[PDB]
Scaffold this motif. Structure first.
Motif, mmCIF file in Angstrom:
data_model
loop_
_atom_site.group_PDB
_atom_site.id
_atom_site.type_symbol
_atom_site.label_atom_id
_atom_site.label_comp_id
_atom_site.label_asym_id
_atom_site.label_seq_id
_atom_site.Cartn_x
_atom_site.Cartn_y
_atom_site.Cartn_z
ATOM 1 N N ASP A 1 42.512 5.325 61.795
ATOM 2 C CA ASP A 1 41.386 6.094 62.332
ATOM 3 C C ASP A 1 41.001 5.637 63.723
ATOM 4 O O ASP A 1 40.320 6.368 64.451
ATOM 5 N N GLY A 2 41.438 4.457 64.122
ATOM 6 C CA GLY A 2 40.999 3.871 65.365
ATOM 7 C C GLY A 2 41.489 2.437 65.414
ATOM 8 O O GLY A 2 42.349 2.036 64.622
ATOM 9 N N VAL A 3 40.912 1.666 66.345
ATOM 10 C CA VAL A 3 41.355 0.318 66.637
ATOM 11 C C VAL A 3 40.149 -0.572 66.911
ATOM 12 O O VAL A 3 39.075 -0.094 67.274
ATOM 13 N N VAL B 1 35.135 0.207 55.798
ATOM 14 C CA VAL B 1 36.064 0.022 56.905
ATOM 15 C C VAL B 1 36.942 -1.175 56.570
ATOM 16 O O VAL B 1 36.452 -2.214 56.103
ATOM 17 N N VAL B 2 38.230 -1.035 56.795
ATOM 18 C CA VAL B 2 39.142 -2.185 56.749
ATOM 19 C C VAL B 2 39.883 -2.271 58.072
ATOM 20 O O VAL B 2 40.385 -1.269 58.594
ATOM 21 N N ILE B 3 39.922 -3.473 58.638
ATOM 22 C CA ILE B 3 40.589 -3.749 59.903
ATOM 23 C C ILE B 3 41.880 -4.471 59.556
ATOM 24 O O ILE B 3 41.854 -5.600 59.065
ATOM 25 N N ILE C 1 37.640 6.075 53.312
ATOM 26 C CA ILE C 1 37.763 4.736 53.867
ATOM 27 C C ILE C 1 38.398 4.798 55.248
ATOM 28 O O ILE C 1 39.407 5.463 55.460
ATOM 29 N N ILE C 2 37.833 4.048 56.165
ATOM 30 C CA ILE C 2 38.277 3.971 57.551
ATOM 31 C C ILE C 2 39.235 2.795 57.696
ATOM 32 O O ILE C 2 38.940 1.683 57.259
ATOM 33 N N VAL C 3 40.372 3.037 58.331
ATOM 34 C CA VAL C 3 41.358 2.006 58.665
ATOM 35 C C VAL C 3 41.416 1.876 60.173
ATOM 36 O O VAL C 3 41.680 2.861 60.874
ATOM 37 N N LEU C 4 41.172 0.656 60.672
ATOM 38 C CA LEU C 4 41.289 0.320 62.088
ATOM 39 C C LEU C 4 42.423 -0.672 62.268
ATOM 40 O O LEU C 4 42.594 -1.579 61.469
ATOM 41 N N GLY C 5 43.188 -0.521 63.343
ATOM 42 C CA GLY C 5 44.170 -1.522 63.700
ATOM 43 C C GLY C 5 43.555 -2.732 64.378
ATOM 44 O O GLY C 5 42.841 -2.607 65.369
ATOM 45 N N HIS C 6 43.887 -3.911 63.879
ATOM 46 C CA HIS C 6 43.357 -5.149 64.429
ATOM 47 C C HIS C 6 44.032 -5.454 65.775
ATOM 48 O O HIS C 6 45.259 -5.561 65.852
#
Ligand SMILES: CCCCCCCCCCCCCCCC(=O)O
Ligand SMILES: C[N+](C)(C)CCO
Ligand SMILES: [Mg+2]
Length: 253
Positions: A39-41, A232-234, A10-15
């Motif tokens: 993982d990213g933003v 993906v969860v933001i 699962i990918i976690v992105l910062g909002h």
């Protein structure tokens, strides 16, 4: 077959970078998100009067900065003159790509269809395999596709009448994902949201979950009930999300 976005993990992105703890859409928040294990933003972009792609959620700089005005009606020198918190200045997309690890994921939400041409150019120079382009505005996505037909693309949905349109939009736009708000669960109901997600997934689409309030991930174990149905969860609070997903034993920190 894009290995940066098609993962078993699962990918976690910062909002907006990491808006729960640092100024939104700032270079500071981006670095911090990555160090917290994202993982990213995800960022929001507009086009300035003088044709530079700048980061900002709203259509005016009122709320996150000490000044007033519509960035589409301002130039970059006027804009780098604002303070968006903790001393940070409004960044350009080019600055974002200098800050980020070359392998970090970047979800660019195009807020301004006029920015699509320049976004596609800047992206082609900065390793497009790690980029996702998203928008609520179909015409922004259609315009982006005039310049770049390979970058991963997500459709942001905020209205129920968009959902039946998804199979045709997937064709017209070559979508990879539908990017769904957790607010859908209260507003239309958990089960209707679940069945809609299930249907979208049956069309071959991936799912990006986002929200304006991280509480909606955790109340009534909303996110947990959707395990298996998102890639993906933001998250507004990266550390909290990274810890939660490790506590379920599904995503290693
Ligand atoms: C897989 C698609 C199914 C989901 C469809 C849900 C449609 C959206 C309805 C709720 C919108 C709420 C958005 C509030 C937050 C915002 O707009 O910033
Ligand atoms: C910011 N998102 C990509 C999560 C959606 C719009 O608010
Ligand atoms: Mg956004």
């Amino acid at each position: 077959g894009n290995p940066m976005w098609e993962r078993d993990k699962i990918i976690v992105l910062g909002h907006r970078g990491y808006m729960a703890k640092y100024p939104e859409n700032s270079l500071l928040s981006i670095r911090k998100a990555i160090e917290a294990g994202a993982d990213g933003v995800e960022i929001d972009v507009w086009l300035s009067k003088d044709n530079k792609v700048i980061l900002m959620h709203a259509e005016t700089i009122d709320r996150t900065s000490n000044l007033k005005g519509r960035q589409k009606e301002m130039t970059l020198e006027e804009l780098k003159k604002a303070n968006i918190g903790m001393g940070e200045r409004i960044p350009t997309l080019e600055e974002v790509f200098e800050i980020l690890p070359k392998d970090a994921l970047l979800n660019i939400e195009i807020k301004d269809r006029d920015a699509a041409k320049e976004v596609a150019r800047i992206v082609s120079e900065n390793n497009p395999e790690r980029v996702m382009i998203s928008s609520f505005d179909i015409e922004a996505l259609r315009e982006y596709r005039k310049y770049d037909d390979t970058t991963i693309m997500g459709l942001l949905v905020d209205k129920e009448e968009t959902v039946p349109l998804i199979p045709k939009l997937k064709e017209k736009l070559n979508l990879w994902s539908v990017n769904v708000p957790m607010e859908a669960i209260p507003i239309i109901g958990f089960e209707k949201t679940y069945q809609a997600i299930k249907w979208v997934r049956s069309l071959g689409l991936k799912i990006v979950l986002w929200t304006e309030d991280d509480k909606l991930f955790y109340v009534d174990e909303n996110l947990k009930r959707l395990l298996g149905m998102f890639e993906v969860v933001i998250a507004n609070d990266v550390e909290r999300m990274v810890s939660y997903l490790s506590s379920l034993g599904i995503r290693l920190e």
